[PDB]
Ligand binder design. Sequence first.
Ligand SMILES: Nc1ncnc2c1ncn2[C@@H]1O[C@@H]2COP(=O)(O)O[C@H]2[C@H]1O
Ligand SMILES: Nc1ncnc2c1ncn2[C@@H]1O[C@@H]2COP(=O)(O)O[C@H]2[C@H]1O
Length: 261
Amino acid sequence: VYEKDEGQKEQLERILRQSFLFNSLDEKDLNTVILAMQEKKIEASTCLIREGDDGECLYIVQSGELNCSKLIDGEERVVKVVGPGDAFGELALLYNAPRAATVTSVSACDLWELGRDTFNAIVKDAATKRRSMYDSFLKSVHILDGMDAYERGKVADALRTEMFTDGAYIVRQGELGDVFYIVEEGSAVATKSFGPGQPPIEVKKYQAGDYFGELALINEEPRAANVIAHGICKVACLERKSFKRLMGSVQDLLSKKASEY
Ligand SMILES: Nc1ncnc2c1ncn2[C@@H]1O[C@@H]2COP(=O)(O)O[C@H]2[C@H]1O
Ligand SMILES: Nc1ncnc2c1ncn2[C@@H]1O[C@@H]2COP(=O)(O)O[C@H]2[C@H]1O
């Protein structure tokens, strides 16, 4: 029941590292969570979690789709579809509350289940601290100064962190771009080739609190420059879909500031 083969562990590690509540774990803590996780397969149209019940575990989806719904004014109202890579059933564990929605599979699903005790011991404090630290950080990132606390908190809830050592390319000129970056600590440099057959030249130096990688998202174009870690660089990362859905009018600010390049 805890036994997993190498293939299973590898796929589980990949999805866990990308999952918001687990993304801040060190590799050994993530390994301990992996040890604790139990596989759970369900057929389509299985009513897995029921609104109002006690919650003693959470799930992450390896494959399949499920609907989350709320019983409101006598009908089930679907409020979110979850699919591969998504975690669900975490709210009852994060906030010590009854299940806030019913979750039903739409297809056959392959899930991994984590118990409340392991979540409490290894994940819960780290996750809530990370969120708070993201909130603190964003309050000193000035392009977000126009947001209110709730807008900024939503962005904070969609951030992941990545570390890059000296010389590692965070983005490469001409590649597809689906991530917006803000430097949390360390440094980076942008270099840009101004035409075919021209080597790139340094065009900007980044420090903590600076952002980059917005142009591919706003303009729907390939990356316009390389961004390379200088010494070391720790970046907060916001995916394209979250950028578009959460940044609001900051997208307009970013668009207008593009003329400064
Ligand atoms: N809008 C929503 N409100 C509440 N729960 C939701 C929503 N969307 C998805 N869910 C998921 O449905 C789950 C129901 O169990 P939990 O309350 O433990 O955790 C909840 C979330 O993972
Ligand atoms: N002179 C410049 N031209 C274009 N992009 C730049 C320049 N200086 C820094 N950048 C950043 O480099 C990033 C490369 O990825 P993007 O095109 O998504 O967004 C770009 C900007 O954030």
